[PDB]
Structure formats: C-alpha cells, structure tokens
Design a protein around this nucleic acid. Structure first.
Ligand code: CA
Length: 615
DNA sequence: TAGCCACGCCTAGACTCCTC
DNA sequence: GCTGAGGAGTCT
DNA sequence: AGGCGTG
C-alpha cells in the first residue's frame, strides 16, 4: 500500500522545508503555488515527476519512457503533467540543436541523406555541426530541417525548467542542514537528490532534539537567490578542476571574482559579518571565499605562483570568512614563497606570523614549525638570528615502528586477494590479538558518540537545531561547541576518566539500546559486529584513554577528526590492545597522524606504525 | 598463403544514463 | 587517483 | 573504429 522509495524521500524533503516559517519567507506567491499544484496530482503523476526530476534534464522520446510500477500506458499521466504545466511536449520543441540531440545517429543519417547539401557520413557530432552551421546562414532552410527532424524524432517530453527550479531551491535549503551540507554535494543534472538520500531518506529515523532557532541566515528571497548562484558557480569550478579543464576553471573563477567584487557594500553583508561562525558559512561571502581558495588551487596548478601568493595574502588579511582555513593558507603561502619564489625573508615573516595565529592548529601548525627548524638550521640561511626567536621547542615523541611483508598482486595483495589493511590484521592475529577493527577515525568517533550522545543532542544552545532531519548540532565542528557546553562536558570527561570498566560497558549499552539505528553523524551502527564487540573494546581502552581522546574530539573535531590510526586490534583474554597505522610501501606519516600518535602514547596506549613490503 | 585494391558486414569495448 | 556496483542501450 | 571474408 505504501509509496515507492523515491517518492517517499522526495516528500520528506518538501515536508521538512515547508514547515520552516523562516524559510517559507524566501519564496514568493507564484512559487508556493507550484508546490501546491504538485500535491494536487495523482499518486501516479507525482511518481512520474520525481522519476524525471531525478533523470538528466533534456528531451526524452516517448518510446524510451517505461515505468510499469507507474502505468502500463503513460499518455494519460503525461497529459496530466503537461496540463499542470510541469512537463512539456514536442509542440514546444523549437531549438534545432535540441532536436538533433534527441535523434539517434541512424536517424541523423536518414536526414543527412534526404537533404542533398549534406555529406552522409561522419560522427553524430560531425553531422550536428553540419546542420547547425547550414541553418545559421540559410535559416529558412533550417526551418525545413527542423520541421522534418521533429517528425522523424516523434513524440517527446521534457521536465519544465521553471517549476523544476523551485524544487532545486527547496532541496538546497534542506541541504543546508543535510545532504550537501554533510560535505559538498556535486548535484549534477541541475540539482537533485543524492543517491544515498533518495534511497533512505524515506526510511531514516533521526535523533531526538529540540529545534530552537533565533536568527535569520538569509535577508530575503534575493539573498538566497544570490547564495544559490554562488553555490552553482563553486560547483562548476570544482567540476571543471575535477575534469582537468583547468583553462575553463581559471575563467569561471576570475569571472566569479568580479561577481564577488561587484557585491561589496550591499546591505545584506553587514548582517552576515555579524552572524556566529557556525551560521556564517551559509552566506555568499563564505562561498565566495571558498571560491577564492579553489582559485589559488587552480593558479598553483598552472604554475602561476606570484598570483597565487597575492590571493593567499588577501584571504589571510581578513578574519571574517573561513578562519578554519587559515592553517591551510599560511602553510601554502609559506611553501610557495620559500619553494617556488625562493624568497627567504618573507618566508620567515610568514612562518612567524602564522605560528602567532591562534587559528592554526594540529597538522598545519606542526608543518609550519618544522619549516622553521629546517630554515634556522640551514647554511645558505644562517645569515640571521631571527628564527632562534624563542621558538617554543614543540617536540613530538617518537613511536614504535615495525615492518612486515606480503606478496603484492589501490594496491591489492594476496595471502585470497586483500588490501594492505587486511594483510596487517593477519599479522596481529598470529601475534596473539584475536580481535581487530579497520575503522580508522570512525571507530573512535562512534565511541565518542555513544559516550556523549545526550550531551551532543542536549538542549539550551541557541540556533544549532533548526529543523526536522539533522544528525548533529550545527556547532559541532566549531570552537563554540565545547565552550557552549563547558559545564556538562568537563563533568562527563572527568566521570569517564575515573570510571571502572563496568560503568563504561553499561554507559555504552544505554545509548546503544536507546538509539540503535537513529541517523547520527559520528556514529556508524554497523561499524561494530554487535553491541557485545563494542563493550569488549571499551573495556580494554578504559577510562583515562577514552576520556583523553574525547577531550580532543569535543574541543576541536574540526582539526582532529582526521589522522587516527587505520587499526585497533586486541586480544580477547589478555585484554591488551594495540593501535596501528598501516603504511604501504608508497606512503608515509602525515602531520595529522603523528600528532595523534604522540597524543595516544601520553595517554599510555600501545601505538605502532606497521609498514608493508611487497614481493 | 603473390600482392594490392574495393566493399560491406559484424562485434568488442567504451561511454552515457539510469537504477536501488 | 579514490570516496557504489551494476546493467542496459548506443555509438564507432 | 577496426577486424574479417569475399569479390
Ligand atoms: Ca594507512
């Protein structure tokens, strides 16, 4: 009796956004009418819409449309949708390119034939270039070809870009708390539902929390429109970079750079600057900064470094947008000056200024530090004394390295085919530890999540919960998450540091039994084979260790979430555990990884780097 | 397989778009 | 260079 | 596109 998965999920999106009064302010009357028109359709008509909303947006032959779970004949349904003005028909098919596109290459031959001026053979593309030229000079004749092609192509439909645009913008908002926002969704096909979401949104159950918002992200329907535009730009840039179309990317960026400079002074930006960090990331300003970042990324690739340094300096001079990224920026500026512009004076100024900055953390901070000690203790440099300058000697403690071997066939080994990580697990089984988990960061994350679930989804912090389908409070990756909860956390961290290893085992089974299945961003329910396995692990890890890890994950999830060892292995009976970063022959330790390793040792834990050698 | 040409048929592999 | 696996239909 | 037979 239920709806198909795709419709359910689509409906969940609309519901969610529709019930925000703050968000409904950003749609005009005409627009809201289109939503209502949708709900006014038959289950069948809704089913067909979502189907094609998901598809790539373009003309579709009627003979290539077939969904039997919808209707054995689709003409009634199609009409309904055209009447509603959601779809359109060959009647409205006007553009020549569009018609030639819609044709099969065989049919494009027939048409190249019965039109004499055309040379019958070549590629679909070649023929389309032929036709599209011909018509641009002798347009009257173009009309005749258009006429005939349409006939030859037959009956056809296409989703209406007017109504569609509204559903995009709704989806965009749903995504500011979700599926573009749990890290950038490259929503191609013009703006759609991500696959994971399209499949499970309808069935997903979410944590219990209390929505309390007391600020507007957007000024008005124009602001949002300006934003959504920045978003589509940023995407296309990334998209370009991703397809190695670096030349096109440069344009798009420089183009967008102007756009951002034109906007300076607009009233809307004053309220933006004043927004707290965890919300400020949802503004044009932020996205344009994010764009500028990729821009230096692009410049660097085209080996245009003086330029790249300029931009880096811009970014670093303001403190309004993306402060988390300053670590990265400094580091990158440092490198570029030193390495590619070979310019030592500023490099030293750069390093010192960066290290001064409270915004730089973990990995990048260390990477800076090292460049300094490399620099101070270099001959062709020693003509100074300015990096002796009371550099608080941030040493990192060294850790037990180890080496094993496996015959190599991402690298794939044999023992049965396997990965580097599975190969190492084998070693540690025969080394006495009958248990092990390849979870990297997730393992530690889902413990921290089972151990602080209620403090996470705790009430009393303004603005972090905003609507129906969240999986985390919005402040989770900000300095403010800990600060906005210092009392309750300082408490719980203490209480874990002291707990007996039964308190732990119990604590876990509460959360597990209460929440098992609820979507939360830190917790992965199938990460552990059972609740039982989850309990063993915390027993071996124990209080002081767990508590210590949790402190960093609460204090700075932004800069800590990454760099945990690939493995946790433990022996069932001895209760001794081991934390293992598995390194192939062809990679090393990253700064983020070593900071962690030192840190886990100070907490007193069996930490080990395990290299693999191939044959 | 003598060596070269002329012509057209068939299909493997790449690619796009779609599905859950 | 990867962050999904797989199928079907089409082009050359 | 490009391998293959056949004329
Ligand atoms: Ca590894």
């Amino acid at each position: 009796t239920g709806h198909p998965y795709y419709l359910r999920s689509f409906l969940v999106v609309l519901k969610t956004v529709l019930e925000n009064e703050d968000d409904m302010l950003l749609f005009d009357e005409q627009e809201k009418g289109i939503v209502t028109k949708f709900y006014q359709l038959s289950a069948t008509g809704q089913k067909l819409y979502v189907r094609l909303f998901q598809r790539k947006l373009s003309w579709i032959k009627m003979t290539k449309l077939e969904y039997e779970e919808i209707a054995l004949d689709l003409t009634p349904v199609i009409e309904e949708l055209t009447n509603a003005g959601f779809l359109q028909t060959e009647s409205e098919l006007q553009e020549l390119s569009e018609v030639l596109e819609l044709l099969s290459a065989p049919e494009l031959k027939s048409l190249a034939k019965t039109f004499h001026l055309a040379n019958p053979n070549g590629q679909k593309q070649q023929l389309v270039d032929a036709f599209l030229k011909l018509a641009k000079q002798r347009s009257v004749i173009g009309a005749v070809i258009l006429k005939r092609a349409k006939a030859l192509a037959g009956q056809s439909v296409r989703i209406c870009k007017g109504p569609r645009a509204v559903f995009s913008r709704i989806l965009l908002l749903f995504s500011l708390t979700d599926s573009m926002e749990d890290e950038d969704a490259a929503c191609g096909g013009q703006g759609q539902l991500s696959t994971v979401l399209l499949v499970n949104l309808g069935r997903m159950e979410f944590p219990s929390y209390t929505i309390n918002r007391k600020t507007h992200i957007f000024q008005d329907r124009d602001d949002l429109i300006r934003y959504a535009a920045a978003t589509h730009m940023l995407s296309d840039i990334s998209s370009a970079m991703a397809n190695g179309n670096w030349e096109e990317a440069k344009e798009l960026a420089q183009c967008a750079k102007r756009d951002w400079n034109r906007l300076k002074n607009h009233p809307s930006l004053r309220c933006h600057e004043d927004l707290p960090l965890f919300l400020r990331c949802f503004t044009v300003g932020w996205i344009y900064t994010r764009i500028l970042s990729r821009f230096v990324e692009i410049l660097q690739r085209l080996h245009m470094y003086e330029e790249a340094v300029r931009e880096l300096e811009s970014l670093l001079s303001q403190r309004i947008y993306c402060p988390d990224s300053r670590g990265r920026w400094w580091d990158r500026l440092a490198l570029n000056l030193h390495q590619h512009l070979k310019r030592l004076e500023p490099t030293i100024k750069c390093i010192t200024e960066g290290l001064a900055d409270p915004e730089v953390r973990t990995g990048h901070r260390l990477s800076l530090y090292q460049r300094a000690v490399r620099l101070r203790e270099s001959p062709s440099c020693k003509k100074f004394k300015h990096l002796f300058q009371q550099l608080p000697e941030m040493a990192v403690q060294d850790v037990k390295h180890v080496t094993i071997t496996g015959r190599l066939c991402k690298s794939v080994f044999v023992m049965v085919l396997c990965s580097v990580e599975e190969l190492a697990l084998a070693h540690y089984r025969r080394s006495g530890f009958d248990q092990g988990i390849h979870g990297e960061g997730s393992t530690f994350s889902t413990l921290y999540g089972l151990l602080l679930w209620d403090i996470i989804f705790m009430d009393g912090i303004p603005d972090v919960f905003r609507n129906a389908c969240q999986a985390f409070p919005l402040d989770l990756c900000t300095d403010s998450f800990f600060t906005s909860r210092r009392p309750a956390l300082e408490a719980r961290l203490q209480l874990i540091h002291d707990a007996p290893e039964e308190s732990l085992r119990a604590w876990v089974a509460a959360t597990w039994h209460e929440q098992e299945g609820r979507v939360a961003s830190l917790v992965s329910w199938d990460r552990f084979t059972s609740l039982q396995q989850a309990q063993d692990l915390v027993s071996c890890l124990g209080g002081p260790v767990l508590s210590g890890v949790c402190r960093h994950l609460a204090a700075d999830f932004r800069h800590c979430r990454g760099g945990l060892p690939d493995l946790v292995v433990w022996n069932s009976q001895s209760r001794h555990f081991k934390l293992v970063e598995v390194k192939g022959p062809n990679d090393r330790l990253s700064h983020k990884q070593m900071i962690w390793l030192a840190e886990l040792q100070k907490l007193g834990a069996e930490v080990e780097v395990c290299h693999v050698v191939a044959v």
